[PDB]
Design a protein around this ligand. Sequence first.
Ligand SMILES: *[C@@H]1O[C@H](CO)[C@@H](O[C@@H]2O[C@H](CO)[C@@H](O[C@@H]3O[C@H](CO)[C@@H](O)[C@H](O)[C@@H]3O)[C@H](O)[C@H]2NC(C)=O)[C@H](O)[C@H]1NC(C)=O
Ligand SMILES: *[C@@H]1O[C@H](CO)[C@@H](O[C@@H]2O[C@H](CO)[C@@H](O[C@@H]3O[C@H](CO)[C@@H](O)[C@H](O)[C@@H]3O)[C@H](O)[C@H]2NC(C)=O)[C@H](O)[C@H]1NC(C)=O
Lengths: 205, 651, 153, 51
Amino acid sequence: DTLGSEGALSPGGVASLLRLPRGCGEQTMIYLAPTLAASRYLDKTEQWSTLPPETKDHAVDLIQKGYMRIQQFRKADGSYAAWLSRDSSTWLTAFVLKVLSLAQEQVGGSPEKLQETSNWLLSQQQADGSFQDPCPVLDRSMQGGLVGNDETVALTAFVTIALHHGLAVFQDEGAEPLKQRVEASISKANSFLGEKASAGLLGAH
Amino acid sequence: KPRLLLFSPSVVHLGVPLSVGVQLQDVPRGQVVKGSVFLRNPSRNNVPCSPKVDFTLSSERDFALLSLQVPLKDAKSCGLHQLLRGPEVQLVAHSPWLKDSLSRTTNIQGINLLFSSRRGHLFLQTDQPIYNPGQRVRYRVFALDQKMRPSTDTITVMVENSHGLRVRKKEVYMPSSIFQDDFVIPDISEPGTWKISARFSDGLESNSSTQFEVKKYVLPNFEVKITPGKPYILTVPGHLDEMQLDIQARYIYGKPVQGVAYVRFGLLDEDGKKTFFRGLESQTKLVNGQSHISLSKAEFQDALEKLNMGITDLQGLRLYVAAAIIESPGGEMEEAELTSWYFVSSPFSLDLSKTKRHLVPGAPFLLQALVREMSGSPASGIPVKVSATVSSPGSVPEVQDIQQNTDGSGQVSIPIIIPQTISELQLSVSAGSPHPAIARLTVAAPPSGGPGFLSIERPDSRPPRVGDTLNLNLRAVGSGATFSHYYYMILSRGQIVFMNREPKRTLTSVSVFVDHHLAPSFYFVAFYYHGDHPVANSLRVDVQAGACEGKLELSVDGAKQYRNGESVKLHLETDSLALVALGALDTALYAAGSKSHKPLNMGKVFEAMNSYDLGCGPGGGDSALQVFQAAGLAFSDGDQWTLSRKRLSCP
Amino acid sequence: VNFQKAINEKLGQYASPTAKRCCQDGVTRLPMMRSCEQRAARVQQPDCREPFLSCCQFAESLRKKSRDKGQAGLQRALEILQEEDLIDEDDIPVRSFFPENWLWRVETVDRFQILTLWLPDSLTTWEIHGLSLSKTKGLCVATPVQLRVFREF
Amino acid sequence: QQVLVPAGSARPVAFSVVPTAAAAVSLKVVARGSFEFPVGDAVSKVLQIEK
Ligand SMILES: *[C@@H]1O[C@H](CO)[C@@H](O[C@@H]2O[C@H](CO)[C@@H](O[C@@H]3O[C@H](CO)[C@@H](O)[C@H](O)[C@@H]3O)[C@H](O)[C@H]2NC(C)=O)[C@H](O)[C@H]1NC(C)=O
Ligand SMILES: *[C@@H]1O[C@H](CO)[C@@H](O[C@@H]2O[C@H](CO)[C@@H](O[C@@H]3O[C@H](CO)[C@@H](O)[C@H](O)[C@@H]3O)[C@H](O)[C@H]2NC(C)=O)[C@H](O)[C@H]1NC(C)=O
């Protein structure tokens, strides 16, 4: 009921079921990440035959619709901004790489552009190993104090999860020059996350 | 003394047949030679690219026009697709006669050619030229081969936005040779020009593209017209025309708008820069929804001096008129602009592109010009006079003053006789009255010690229709040779389409039958041999406006004014069973003020078919070796070589 | 007229396009009535704030001094009208919305065929284009035929 | 309601109405030319009425 013809794979997708305006750039992934998760459940359980066969056409239309919309927010240097002509956000750039790495095969995307995207995220890693955003889309960590500790750790963990999904894009061309840099960047950030997790006092999120 | 001639188009397109011309001269009376010609990799171990076409040449059939297939799969096996330094391949002819009688050190003879993956013809069009973010856009692409017949090969179609990023990429193999696709522009899109590009999947550089503008929503409440009194401004020392315009504002149903019109004047550069006159902005009230604005010659010169310019400083700029009409009852306003008010030196313009710019000493030089009236191309009945300064070596230069009246589509062809002892020719062309359009050209004579020249004379220089017979005169000039035949060939769309010989007479005439294969323009190349030296010259013939094979006719019988909703019946008639792709476009988006990206016509189709033409000139003739290069060919006789193009372009 | 000349004369004091754009934003009247200095404090670049503040202060002072003076006439009534806006030197907006392309299709036609169609309503006359694709005879471009749709009432 | 419309002109016609339903009503305005003129047009649109 959640991922079927009456759910995430409806002709209008979950975007019409969530019932909120989706003008912002991050909201474009509501056409992508839920549709991808709905396809993963039906693929691994071999349940496409139960639904009407036109659902697969609905799925690829939603993913291509999201890819076509989100690419309008792409900056020249491979980063993504919350709005058009707005400053680039490290968090949103990570979210795009985490989702578009899975969807690029079926939408006709370019692996070269995603390799350019991950290189920009690597340039935002600080000396400690944490990542930094000059204008994050989400703040969240409020009411509970020590906001800088939670934000930097949550952002770093979110970028690493995005960079790991980006490893699936690489082939033989980027196996030596770029893939080794990303794996080292993930290991450098995991050292930051490891000491902060061992030190404790992190928020629940 | 005996030799084998090999010419071929300068660039071979992979996947489509390459027409190869082979000819031999000065052979014994009963000689018969045989061999093979094929493409081979100039790198590696010089692996031949599979297909070999054999030739058998006799003294009674000394020429052969061959078709080399050159398939894609064997081009990859040859290793050309991998590349190294440049995209070049060599076409080589193998015959024992090279070692058997010419005694050339190698049994192989060939020349280097560039290669390209471009093949076929791809036409693509959108359902509208101008869209708004949020609108769906339908586009269709047509696939045709070299012979303008439907092609079923797989294509890859891609759409990029204003910033050049792909938003869609699809691969489709298409029977019936028409592919249609829909998509919706996201509403947050930045305004600009998007581009759709379609190419054959195997042809990496076979791309054809159409582009459209996506812009923000704007619909005027009432129509606004800016109408100049004269559609151009004449600037001549001591004279300046009236410079007057009318401004009209009315609602669509007809009632005139009651309001005030604010008009401002400036200069519009050809790059796009706008420079306003700060003191000459004017405000006038509309009467009957209209207003008449006049800018005096005194005010205009005062305006130019305000920004430190003179009347002489005008250089093809446009007088810019920007009008804002504000309604009096409502207060809302609409704007309009006039960007087509050029400063011109004459009501006519001269096109001198068809001039050879290469002299043939001792033979008439044809001055070819086209006179346009800016509003339209054909300026017929206009007197055009040429002043020809013939610079002789040593003696005083002599002047020829010839004139003729343009006719037909505004063309003119003025013979200018030049002696055999000439250093350079300087031409001064003056067309139109009272204010003439001028064009000045200087041509240098070929080297004086040349081994003779060939003159190709054309009696009536009017473009022939498809089906007419054109007669061309071959006239050798200079020292004179002992040759037995003239050799001529026809080049159309970058391929050798015809080749033949013509015997040497006191007056030799070649009759060419122009059919559909030769449209829209073809090169006529002719040559003879004088003591192991080729002597050649070429002439480009433009074919008159052609028509389809068969026909497609659309007709709505009777009066074509219809009301809303009621049915209308359209008649479609065609020569065979065919796929008829239709489309209805509003006349507003195609109006004068809009840079509309005009739709397809037969002119666009013929121009697209001519994209494979390799001719980088109007005829050439300075040197017999490079007159084949100026026609688009690469050629070698075993003694001299063509240099081969640096790039698929005309430097 | 006098308002347009003075604002353009103020714009003439700034030669850089960055300064002109920051100045042109200043002379534009905000919808809600925020104080000029209060409004000018928002812009993030001080190199943009300095011309923005100067043009905003000059525009508001000039607009209030010229206020209530316009609409001359023999009548003793006074028409209420909004404050004059700067007429942009940016490009004018050419119409961008046009009716959708009906009859965008491809039909199999054997020798000849007639299509019965229902005409969408509009006041602009349109022209129909056509492309014929034949396997034996190739591509052909039809000459456009005009169809003028009009409304009596 | 008899309304005179001049040539090449537009004339608004004022009708008064107040919705008492709670769903949606399709209202249709009918215009017909008098005398022997067959001119006339009708427009039907749905008016969404909310609580
Ligand atoms: C098929 O695709 C090729 C590859 O993009 C197209 O060639 C490109 O053509 C454009 C237009 O001429 C070139 O841009 C121009 O460059 C010159 C020199 O810098 C500049 O002065 C112009 O203002 C313009 O920017 C572009 O360089 C060229 N691509 C390459 C790699 O050279 C070709 O036009 C396409 N053909 C069709 C029919 O779409
Ligand atoms: C059709 O409709 C039009 C518009 O409503 C009618 O025009 C009106 O015609 C009358 C009679 O001619 C005009 O009144 C006269 O005006 C003149 C000055 O123009 C004056 O000297 C006369 O004493 C008289 O008052 C009236 O002004 C005019 N409407 C407008 C807006 O100017 C027309 O009459 C109608 N056709 C018929 C056959 O009734």
